Design a protein around this ligand. Structure first.
Ligand SMILES: [Cl-]
Ligand SMILES: [Cl-]
Length: 123
């Protein structure tokens, strides 16, 4: 009974991104987070592996965490070279972290349902 596409084993609820005062969270506890990938969306998602972020909407150009299991954002995962993470994240910040845009780390879900830790930018 393998999971359906982009459905995590632990279920959507634990992967729903939930807005909160200091910043968004997910209930799943990945155990050791060492993010080395960037979750892209919108017109900026043109290459990479498809990945979904639950509890998030894109209705304009910067994604919004909402906390509804009916909201989903389907983007693409850009994997950084494992020793280049600082360099890539610094450049990513300049490219995407415009004024009022925030950076975080989220668990995205891949086609086979497996999760992965990724940086992302949101408001
Ligand atoms: Cl926007
Ligand atoms: Cl869709």
């Amino acid at each position: 009974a393998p999971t359906q596409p982009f459905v995590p084993r632990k279920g959507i609820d634990k992967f729903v991104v939930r807005p909160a005062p200091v910043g968004p969270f997910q209930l799943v506890s990945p155990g050791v987070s060492e993010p080395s990938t960037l979750f892209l969306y919108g017109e900026d998602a043109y290459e990479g592996e498809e990945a979904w972020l639950y509890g998030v909407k894109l209705t304009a150009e910067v994604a919004v965490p909402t906390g509804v299991p009916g909201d989903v954002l389907k983007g693409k995962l850009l994997r950084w070279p494992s020793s280049s993470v600082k360099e890539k994240l610094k450049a990513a910040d300049e490219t995407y972290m415009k004024e009022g845009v925030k950076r975080g780390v989220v668990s995205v879900v891949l086609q086979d349902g497996s999760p992965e830790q990724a940086y992302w930018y949101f408001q």
